Amino acid sequence: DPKWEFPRKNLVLGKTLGEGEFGKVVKATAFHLKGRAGYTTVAVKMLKENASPSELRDLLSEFNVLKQVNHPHVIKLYGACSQDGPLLLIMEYAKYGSLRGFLRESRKVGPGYLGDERALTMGDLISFAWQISQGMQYLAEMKLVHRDLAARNILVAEGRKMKISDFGLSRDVYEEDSYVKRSQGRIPVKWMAIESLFDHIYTTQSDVWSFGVLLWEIVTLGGNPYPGIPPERLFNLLKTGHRMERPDNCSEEMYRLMLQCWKQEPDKRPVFADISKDLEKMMVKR
Amino acid sequence: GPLSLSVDAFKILEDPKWEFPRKNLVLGKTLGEGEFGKVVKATAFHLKGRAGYTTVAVKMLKENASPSELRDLLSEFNVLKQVNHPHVIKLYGACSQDGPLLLIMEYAKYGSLRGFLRESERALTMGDLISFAWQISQGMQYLAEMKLVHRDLAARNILVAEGRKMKISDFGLSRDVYQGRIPVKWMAIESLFDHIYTTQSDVWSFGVLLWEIVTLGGNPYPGIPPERLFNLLKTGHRMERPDNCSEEMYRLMLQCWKQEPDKRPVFADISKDLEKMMVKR
Ligand SMILES: CN(C)CCCNc1ccn2ncc(-c3ccc4c(c3)OCO4)c2n1
Ligand SMILES: CN(C)CCCNc1ccn2ncc(-c3ccc4c(c3)OCO4)c2n1
Ligand SMILES: [Cl-]
């Protein structure tokens, strides 16, 4: 695709920013990128060593989705090097790294959380969740299920702007408004809706469940969901109606929004437009 | 769904052959973590009615495990409880009643074959490498006769136990003849193009393993990205004879990579070529 193809000689790769089930991401610079003169600092996504077909399919899927979507709170694709060498996706650089990393650093780095980019209040946290909701609201309009919504898969960029990232597992639902997988998925159990875990059904409403988990991660400043609970225990724990407890740093209204995202019946869960409205009300009143 | 049914069976059956009391198990240092989960060294008291403490390896889910990772563990339990061979890593038991699911396995003090070769500045004869290749062939021959496809054969997925005995490990992806999770550089052409896996696709993987052995842990198709390998294999390219590799050994490799699965050797033939190398010093 000439719209996206970038000259490989104008890209220079540097240190690894992260490596895992999502693949490899390095910090880079691009010369004469999309008409910007001189060098622009970028992130480059590529396959890790000993890549499987699934990891190549995920890199290509990501390329295909980010070609079609544009939102202030979705990480930007700028280009690709897809000829005569490894597939490289050139992306928007997010200087603060993952949201999980950023929130966790805030327990340790002053001014920290207060109940300046390192100073955080409950207002900041509600704003982070609101930015992510708006991104997801747009993605749902675009008939996309992300499936991998989690604090580790959100990026924090210039001005502490939230950028939804990690589109490798995202799927089109234009027909039936569900994505169904015969085999077992690669989404961590503890972020999965009950119907995704038992029935392999992914919808915008299963993204709403995952958003509720992300909400619990945000207010706990990067806490580990269902802490101490082995993942195989979540089958029984969720079907008997157990949900994570209200954490210490959480209003009743915020906990009620989480509980609503974890309703057993997907249709009883709020939609992203309603989540964005609930987070707007919370902001304004405080 | 299929996984909730297996998890629940596993927590319920409490099979006295396999269930090991959690209080008799003492977990020690981490041996390895990755896509295969987490394995730690441990001691097990009265394992299988053995006296005192047996040193064991314990496999468990790593952090943030997916349904795929949990299915791989149960699936390993399912396959390994049915197999018994000196060059296949043994299952001794499971803990399914007390916190995280644990599999209790034969311990391999030298770790992975890949790690054991890359540190070889230890001394190996071509005779040893060919012993290693032969042992794996024996394990694979026994698995194929049981109609199990391993799918995942690689030097990183072979363990080295006491006396440098080879142990085939990583049975999570294995299938009983009668998804895209294997690294592309170990996959047969028909697995890449048509998603077929048979004993003959295990033989292709075995040919890549021979090449890792002879290069003392080399990286297959060095500096070729996996995305390009699809067209290079399709057009009949294969890795060059490596340094310190006989014609005989390299001919065995090339036959494991025939395009037509029917033209590859079976494991009995691979075993016989290494038995014949052996007697012919
Ligand atoms: C798991 N997710 C977050 C992977 C997202 C992969 N795509 C991108 C795109 C742009 N940027 N800009 C910075 C990073 C980055 C920084 C630190 C990290 C990092 C990515 O992964 C862990 O630590 C990045 N990644
Ligand atoms: C990827 N494969 C090899 C994982 C196999 C997992 N099952 C077992 C079973 C028994 N043992 N006894 C030692 C190890 C071990 C040591 C160092 C490692 C290691 C496993 O993995 C990497 O480094 C072991 N693993
Ligand atoms: Cl990404």
XYZ file of C-alpha atoms and ligand atoms in Angstrom:
618
model
C 0.000 0.000 0.000
C 1.617 3.245 -1.254
C -0.493 5.276 1.243
C 1.479 3.539 4.112
C 4.712 2.069 2.670
C 7.784 3.929 4.078
C 11.406 3.791 2.765
C 13.368 1.402 5.011
C 16.604 3.495 4.684
C 14.778 6.529 6.304
C 14.013 4.466 9.502
C 16.620 3.966 12.309
C 15.820 1.511 15.165
C 17.072 1.936 18.738
C 16.372 0.466 22.167
C 13.641 -2.070 22.915
C 10.672 -0.441 24.743
C 8.839 -3.789 25.338
C 8.689 -7.480 24.296
C 6.030 -10.113 25.148
C 2.981 -11.955 23.745
C 2.167 -8.675 21.784
C 5.570 -8.921 19.932
C 8.519 -6.433 20.009
C 8.402 -2.600 20.120
C 11.506 -0.415 19.727
C 12.047 3.360 19.947
C 13.020 4.713 16.491
C 13.367 7.795 14.311
C 11.858 8.310 10.803
C 13.414 10.770 8.255
C 10.874 12.708 6.051
C 7.836 10.938 7.594
C 4.417 12.030 6.092
C 5.853 15.373 4.836
C 7.476 16.367 8.250
C 11.011 17.582 7.344
C 13.926 15.999 9.270
C 13.551 13.176 11.820
C 10.471 12.284 13.882
C 10.660 10.084 17.022
C 8.395 7.017 16.519
C 7.738 3.530 17.934
C 8.313 0.558 15.577
C 6.366 -2.697 16.159
C 7.899 -5.874 14.710
C 7.844 -9.689 15.233
C 9.964 -11.010 18.190
C 12.591 -13.805 17.557
C 11.047 -17.224 16.589
C 7.694 -15.685 15.528
C 4.744 -18.099 14.888
C 2.094 -17.729 12.167
C -0.305 -16.388 14.868
C 2.144 -13.481 15.674
C 2.488 -12.632 11.906
C -1.342 -12.759 11.524
C -1.663 -10.431 14.565
C 0.941 -7.913 13.191
C -0.920 -7.865 9.819
C -4.385 -7.569 11.516
C -3.103 -4.572 13.562
C -1.799 -2.975 10.292
C -5.223 -3.587 8.643
C -7.292 -2.122 11.550
C -5.020 0.972 12.155
C -5.096 1.782 8.376
C -8.907 2.381 8.840
C -9.227 4.085 12.302
C -8.250 7.598 13.507
C -9.063 8.872 17.040
C -7.149 11.115 19.505
C -7.153 8.232 22.070
C -6.163 5.403 19.631
C -2.420 5.051 18.923
C -1.616 6.309 15.367
C -0.115 4.225 12.584
C 2.230 6.423 10.412
C 3.586 3.720 8.046
C 5.079 0.277 7.426
C 8.229 -1.283 5.879
C 6.734 -4.463 4.355
C 9.184 -5.159 1.438
C 12.680 -6.767 1.333
C 13.008 -7.291 5.149
C 10.978 -7.843 8.382
C 7.471 -6.260 8.612
C 7.809 -3.003 10.672
C 4.816 -0.884 11.733
C 5.779 2.784 12.392
C 3.589 4.179 15.173
C 2.918 7.275 17.322
C 5.553 7.366 20.139
C 4.014 7.407 23.672
C 6.752 8.862 25.890
C 5.321 7.732 29.293
C 4.954 4.008 28.231
C 2.066 1.747 29.397
C -0.733 3.117 31.671
C -0.086 0.212 34.051
C 3.646 1.197 34.198
C 2.764 4.906 34.607
C 0.254 4.303 37.447
C 2.677 1.885 39.218
C 5.574 4.441 38.966
C 3.141 6.968 40.681
C 3.250 4.886 43.981
C 7.001 5.577 44.079
C 7.656 8.858 42.084
C 6.514 12.162 43.688
C 4.355 14.034 43.811
C 2.443 10.741 43.233
C -1.284 10.131 43.959
C -2.956 12.931 46.038
C -6.482 11.457 46.834
C 2.930 18.430 37.025
C 2.734 15.140 34.960
C 3.684 13.003 38.079
C 0.967 14.612 40.328
C -2.270 12.534 40.166
C -5.706 13.105 41.712
C -8.932 11.080 41.426
C -9.855 13.752 38.758
C -6.834 12.664 36.614
C -7.798 8.939 37.025
C -11.448 9.621 35.982
C -10.111 11.626 32.994
C -7.840 8.677 31.917
C -10.851 6.285 32.010
C -13.019 8.899 30.150
C -10.392 9.267 27.341
C -10.259 5.420 26.970
C -14.130 5.237 26.943
C -14.267 7.796 24.055
C -11.661 5.767 22.086
C -13.651 2.527 22.692
C -16.927 4.344 21.860
C -15.438 5.171 18.370
C -13.963 1.608 17.934
C -17.499 0.129 18.737
C -19.030 2.524 16.106
C -16.366 1.182 13.685
C -17.777 -2.354 14.475
C -14.483 -3.463 16.113
C -14.081 -5.610 19.255
C -10.630 -4.928 20.786
C -10.770 -8.047 23.085
C -7.466 -7.127 24.900
C -8.451 -3.960 26.878
C -6.151 -3.762 29.995
C -3.940 -1.075 31.646
C -0.835 -2.843 30.139
C -2.334 -2.330 26.585
C -3.003 1.448 26.941
C -0.144 3.926 26.312
C 0.432 7.354 27.925
C 1.691 9.962 25.415
C 2.644 13.707 25.356
C 0.325 15.715 27.708
C -0.571 12.434 29.526
C -3.042 11.540 26.715
C -4.418 7.949 26.762
C -3.725 5.931 23.513
C -5.474 2.505 23.152
C -2.783 0.145 21.689
C -2.352 -3.647 20.996
C -4.801 -4.229 18.074
C -3.375 -7.724 17.197
C -6.419 -9.540 18.723
C -9.031 -6.971 17.556
C -11.766 -8.374 15.245
C -14.471 -7.015 12.938
C -18.072 -7.748 14.032
C -19.907 -6.107 11.059
C -22.086 -9.360 10.842
C -24.033 -10.460 14.017
C -22.140 -7.905 16.184
C -20.188 -10.873 17.743
C -16.797 -12.521 17.123
C -16.698 -16.242 18.019
C -13.544 -18.389 18.213
C -13.826 -22.235 18.245
C -10.414 -22.601 20.037
C -9.016 -21.060 23.285
C -7.979 -17.397 23.081
C -4.735 -15.648 24.142
C -6.481 -12.976 26.330
C -5.460 -13.309 30.027
C -8.410 -15.019 31.849
C -8.727 -12.221 34.479
C -9.702 -9.548 31.844
C -12.236 -11.770 29.994
C -16.044 -11.398 30.269
C -17.892 -14.469 31.588
C -19.493 -15.219 28.120
C -15.998 -14.888 26.436
C -14.473 -17.314 28.997
C -17.314 -19.971 28.931
C -18.897 -19.426 25.456
C -16.023 -17.892 23.367
C -18.310 -14.899 22.473
C -16.699 -11.472 22.045
C -18.845 -8.363 21.576
C -18.645 -4.617 22.389
C -20.354 -5.737 25.679
C -17.365 -8.068 26.449
C -15.089 -5.019 25.827
C -17.299 -3.237 28.480
C -16.517 -6.040 30.973
C -12.743 -5.658 30.262
C -13.151 -1.831 30.676
C -14.545 -2.469 34.203
C -11.353 -4.457 35.019
C -9.265 -1.550 33.568
C -11.301 0.813 35.869
C -10.290 -1.347 38.900
C -6.637 -1.243 37.613
C -6.770 2.593 37.266
C -8.175 3.324 40.795
C -5.738 0.786 42.414
C -2.832 2.615 40.567
C -2.000 -0.534 38.566
C -3.203 -3.249 40.954
C -3.394 -6.948 39.899
C -7.000 -8.075 39.395
C -8.374 -10.950 41.567
C -5.093 -10.774 43.556
C -3.926 -14.188 44.897
C -6.665 -16.010 42.909
C -5.431 -18.630 40.423
C -6.950 -17.957 36.987
C -8.531 -21.466 36.722
C -10.610 -20.503 39.839
C -12.355 -17.721 37.828
C -14.705 -20.166 36.048
C -16.508 -21.044 39.338
C -15.924 -17.595 41.045
C -17.699 -15.666 38.163
C -20.626 -18.158 37.571
C -21.596 -18.086 41.298
C -21.794 -14.252 41.009
C -18.518 -13.166 42.724
C -16.827 -9.935 41.514
C -13.756 -8.027 42.815
C -14.429 -5.945 45.986
C -14.560 -2.133 46.080
C -10.868 -1.067 46.395
C -9.857 1.559 49.076
C -9.306 4.462 46.598
C -12.807 4.159 44.908
C -16.113 6.157 45.213
C -19.461 4.281 45.500
C -20.417 5.731 42.031
C -17.150 4.403 40.454
C -17.673 0.943 42.076
C -21.316 0.873 40.861
C -20.006 1.579 37.291
C -17.521 -1.401 37.643
C -20.296 -3.751 38.962
C -22.545 -2.621 35.977
C -19.694 -3.533 33.495
C -19.542 -7.047 35.166
C -23.297 -7.924 34.970
C -23.638 -11.596 33.929
C -26.184 -10.542 31.189
C -24.256 -8.556 28.508
C -27.400 -6.458 27.660
C -27.604 -5.250 31.316
C -24.052 -3.753 30.987
C -23.783 -0.089 29.968
C -22.663 0.873 26.416
C -19.483 3.008 25.961
C -21.573 6.176 25.230
C -23.204 5.745 28.678
C -19.834 4.982 30.318
C -18.401 8.243 28.801
C -21.467 10.178 30.176
C -21.091 8.533 33.672
C -17.358 9.533 33.844
C -18.231 13.114 32.625
C -20.887 13.467 35.462
C -18.265 12.229 38.073
C -15.651 14.763 36.793
C -18.011 17.784 36.866
C -19.609 17.095 40.329
C -16.037 16.868 41.894
C -17.122 -24.428 26.813
C -14.437 -27.139 26.239
C -11.988 -25.574 28.732
C -14.502 -24.984 31.619
C -15.488 -28.733 31.201
C -11.763 -29.898 31.410
C -10.953 -27.514 34.341
C -13.943 -28.774 36.327
C -13.240 -32.524 35.569
C -9.577 -31.943 36.627
C -10.634 -30.324 39.981
C -13.284 -33.153 40.537
C -11.784 -36.556 39.386
C -8.987 -36.562 42.078
C -7.391 -39.647 40.346
C -5.430 -41.503 43.097
C -2.849 -42.667 40.461
C -1.884 -39.021 39.742
C -3.077 -36.713 42.613
C -0.073 -35.759 44.832
C -0.665 -34.260 48.339
C 0.285 -30.525 48.168
C 1.806 -30.666 51.707
C 4.436 -33.209 50.477
C 5.755 -30.690 47.852
C 8.348 -27.938 48.556
C 8.807 -25.505 45.614
C 12.354 -24.148 45.070
C 14.060 -21.925 42.459
C 12.646 -20.971 39.011
C 14.268 -23.055 36.225
C 12.415 -21.326 33.366
C 9.516 -19.008 32.446
C 7.943 -18.329 29.015
C 5.153 -19.209 26.528
C 5.307 -22.779 28.065
C 4.407 -21.218 31.508
C 6.652 -21.440 34.629
C 8.785 -24.395 35.902
C 10.468 -24.550 39.325
C 12.734 -27.120 41.000
C 11.026 -28.871 43.956
C 11.239 -31.820 46.365
C 8.396 -34.328 46.672
C 7.963 -36.542 49.726
C 6.759 -40.122 49.043
C 6.318 -39.445 45.268
C 4.826 -42.675 43.719
C 5.673 -44.535 46.978
C 9.406 -43.663 46.666
C 11.320 -43.308 49.961
C 12.238 -39.773 51.192
C 12.483 -36.763 48.840
C 12.535 -37.025 44.960
C 13.918 -33.921 43.183
C 11.259 -32.922 40.588
C 10.349 -30.159 38.173
C 6.972 -28.510 38.714
C 5.108 -26.849 35.832
C 2.491 -24.219 36.631
C 0.657 -21.326 34.871
C 2.762 -18.089 34.625
C 1.326 -14.598 35.492
C -1.770 -13.418 33.550
C -2.337 -16.882 31.948
C -4.797 -17.087 28.969
C -7.275 -19.972 28.294
C -4.727 -21.233 25.689
C -2.012 -21.534 28.426
C -4.430 -23.333 30.819
C -5.581 -25.680 27.978
C -1.857 -26.470 27.192
C -1.262 -27.524 30.810
C -4.346 -29.831 31.051
C -3.573 -31.183 27.539
C 0.064 -31.979 28.702
C -1.420 -33.881 31.704
C -3.796 -35.740 29.304
C -0.989 -36.865 26.897
C 1.867 -37.565 29.388
C -0.274 -39.784 31.693
C -0.544 -42.229 28.690
C 3.137 -42.280 27.561
C 6.247 -44.003 29.024
C 9.673 -43.896 27.273
C 13.207 -43.226 28.468
C 13.627 -40.205 26.066
C 10.212 -38.670 26.872
C 10.004 -36.501 30.039
C 7.814 -38.314 32.679
C 4.698 -37.045 34.463
C 4.807 -38.172 38.163
C 1.574 -36.451 39.305
C -0.571 -33.322 39.706
C -1.827 -31.054 42.512
C -5.396 -29.968 41.623
C -6.984 -29.455 45.158
C -4.827 -26.689 46.770
C -4.248 -23.387 45.027
C -2.704 -23.271 41.569
C -2.758 -26.377 39.310
C 0.699 -28.001 39.382
C 2.161 -30.779 37.193
C 4.953 -32.852 38.803
C 7.567 -33.966 36.279
C 10.911 -35.721 35.997
C 13.694 -33.197 36.696
C 16.358 -32.513 33.983
C 19.401 -30.942 35.725
C 21.007 -29.574 32.468
C 17.885 -27.651 31.301
C 17.094 -27.224 27.566
C 19.208 -28.860 24.823
C 19.565 -25.400 23.162
C 21.023 -23.870 26.412
C 23.184 -27.024 26.964
C 24.719 -26.725 23.385
C 25.216 -22.884 23.384
C 27.387 -23.367 26.541
C 29.412 -25.965 24.460
C 33.098 -23.865 26.669
C 32.276 -27.587 27.505
C 33.473 -30.505 25.297
C 31.230 -32.625 22.966
C 32.278 -35.193 20.299
C 30.276 -35.571 17.014
C 29.527 -39.057 18.483
C 27.673 -37.333 21.409
C 25.613 -34.970 19.125
C 24.631 -38.135 17.106
C 23.811 -39.981 20.352
C 21.548 -36.957 21.261
C 19.926 -36.969 17.773
C 19.443 -40.787 18.078
C 17.805 -40.610 21.562
C 15.273 -37.981 20.328
C 14.586 -40.176 17.204
C 13.837 -43.108 19.599
C 11.368 -40.936 21.586
C 9.779 -39.594 18.377
C 9.608 -43.137 16.902
C 7.711 -44.307 20.028
C 5.353 -41.257 19.875
C 4.550 -41.806 16.127
C 3.787 -45.545 16.790
C 1.310 -44.274 19.490
C -0.129 -41.965 16.732
C 0.887 -38.710 18.580
C 2.077 -35.712 16.519
C 4.302 -33.514 18.747
C 4.048 -30.375 16.422
C 6.627 -28.521 18.609
C 9.989 -30.366 18.045
C 12.935 -27.977 18.670
C 16.213 -27.839 20.685
C 14.508 -25.360 23.155
C 11.778 -28.118 23.721
C 14.215 -31.031 24.481
C 15.552 -31.382 28.054
C 18.965 -32.784 29.130
C 18.705 -34.971 32.271
C 21.257 -36.882 34.450
C 23.915 -38.604 32.247
C 23.103 -36.251 29.279
C 19.945 -38.335 28.493
C 17.625 -36.521 26.035
C 14.022 -35.938 27.240
C 11.349 -34.692 24.787
C 9.184 -32.051 26.627
C 6.462 -29.421 25.792
C 3.431 -31.678 24.984
C 0.914 -28.715 25.102
C 0.446 -28.602 21.277
C 0.635 -32.430 20.755
C -2.333 -34.121 18.927
C -3.563 -37.758 18.614
C -4.009 -38.364 14.789
C -5.832 -41.754 15.506
C -4.045 -22.087 15.428
C -0.493 -20.955 14.352
C 1.630 -21.288 17.572
C 4.806 -23.113 16.335
C 7.698 -20.792 15.267
C 7.612 -20.604 11.434
C 11.328 -21.587 11.026
C 10.576 -25.098 12.584
C 7.310 -25.758 10.587
C 6.965 -28.117 7.562
C 5.954 -26.473 4.224
C 2.441 -28.079 4.336
C 1.973 -26.825 7.971
C 2.838 -23.225 6.827
C 0.639 -23.399 3.603
C -2.269 -25.831 4.474
C -2.036 -26.039 8.348
C -1.458 -29.879 8.124
C 0.434 -31.560 10.957
C 1.433 -35.235 10.770
C 4.403 -37.455 11.858
C 5.956 -36.328 8.503
C 5.674 -32.639 9.674
C 7.356 -33.786 12.977
C 10.145 -35.295 10.723
C 10.604 -31.832 9.029
C 10.869 -30.256 12.549
C 13.371 -33.073 13.437
C 15.532 -31.989 10.445
C 15.640 -28.385 11.883
C 16.543 -29.920 15.332
C 19.461 -31.906 13.682
C 20.734 -28.566 12.288
C 20.523 -26.916 15.783
C 22.433 -29.909 17.250
C 25.285 -29.808 14.623
C 25.656 -25.982 14.966
C 25.832 -26.380 18.847
C 22.627 -24.289 19.224
C 22.711 -22.164 16.028
C 19.657 -20.052 14.991
C 17.894 -21.522 11.884
C 17.960 -19.526 8.568
C 20.176 -16.880 10.247
C 19.146 -13.288 9.312
C 16.151 -14.404 7.200
C 12.890 -12.938 8.574
C 10.068 -15.548 8.949
C 7.809 -13.527 6.592
C 10.274 -14.232 3.650
C 10.858 -17.995 4.472
C 7.350 -18.895 3.045
C 8.510 -18.078 -0.562
C 12.149 -19.365 -0.079
C 10.800 -22.835 1.057
C 8.007 -22.756 -1.625
C 10.699 -22.214 -4.360
C 12.890 -25.082 -2.927
C 15.555 -23.207 -0.854
C 16.868 -24.985 2.303
C 19.702 -24.268 4.770
C 23.288 -24.878 3.407
C 25.445 -27.683 4.890
C 26.813 -26.055 8.099
C 30.530 -26.069 9.197
C 31.545 -29.310 11.052
C 28.733 -31.417 9.438
C 29.346 -34.695 7.474
C 27.804 -35.205 3.987
C 25.887 -38.195 5.500
C 24.435 -36.023 8.351
C 23.568 -33.170 5.923
C 21.882 -35.637 3.487
C 19.716 -36.851 6.418
C 18.719 -33.146 7.140
C 17.817 -32.434 3.467
C 15.615 -35.584 3.264
C 13.646 -34.413 6.379
C 12.899 -31.180 4.347
C 11.547 -32.838 1.122
C 8.499 -30.841 -0.093
C 6.461 -34.085 -0.449
C 5.773 -35.519 3.087
C 5.729 -39.114 1.575
C 9.428 -38.670 0.480
C 10.729 -37.764 4.010
C 12.147 -40.617 6.148
C 10.023 -42.096 8.995
C 11.547 -41.983 12.544
C 12.599 -45.724 12.306
C 14.696 -44.722 9.208
C 16.174 -41.671 11.019
C 16.946 -43.964 14.036
C 18.600 -46.592 11.686
C 20.823 -43.914 9.936
C 22.155 -42.870 13.414
C 22.529 -46.561 14.585
C 24.584 -47.162 11.316
C 26.674 -43.950 11.774
C 27.343 -45.236 15.364
C 28.711 -48.802 14.492
C 30.733 -47.114 11.596
C 32.773 -45.063 14.220
C 1.853 -3.781 25.625
N 1.555 -2.620 24.773
C 1.707 -1.376 25.528
C 2.365 -2.632 23.527
C 2.015 -1.531 22.526
C 2.844 -1.630 21.249
N 2.880 -0.414 20.436
C 3.467 0.711 20.831
C 3.248 1.881 20.068
C 3.831 3.035 20.453
N 4.562 3.033 21.597
N 5.178 4.099 22.179
C 5.748 3.632 23.292
C 5.557 2.237 23.408
C 5.924 1.362 24.543
C 6.621 1.901 25.629
C 6.934 1.135 26.747
C 6.460 -0.145 26.777
C 5.748 -0.678 25.725
C 5.475 0.038 24.607
O 5.445 -2.003 25.986
C 5.826 -2.216 27.349
O 6.638 -1.106 27.752
C 4.761 1.869 22.323
N 4.223 0.706 21.908
C 10.508 -25.036 27.017
N 10.597 -26.349 27.644
C 12.002 -26.759 27.785
C 9.886 -26.352 28.939
C 9.585 -27.734 29.505
C 8.843 -27.679 30.822
N 8.947 -28.913 31.587
C 10.035 -29.220 32.297
C 10.073 -30.477 32.952
C 11.159 -30.824 33.668
N 12.205 -29.949 33.707
N 13.403 -30.105 34.346
C 14.080 -28.987 34.091
C 13.339 -28.085 33.321
C 13.751 -26.776 32.759
C 15.012 -26.244 33.044
C 15.461 -25.052 32.476
C 14.625 -24.428 31.601
C 13.407 -24.973 31.265
C 12.952 -26.135 31.813
O 12.769 -24.173 30.344
C 13.719 -23.156 30.000
O 14.830 -23.259 30.897
C 12.136 -28.713 33.054
N 11.033 -28.353 32.362
Cl 0.186 -1.405 19.223
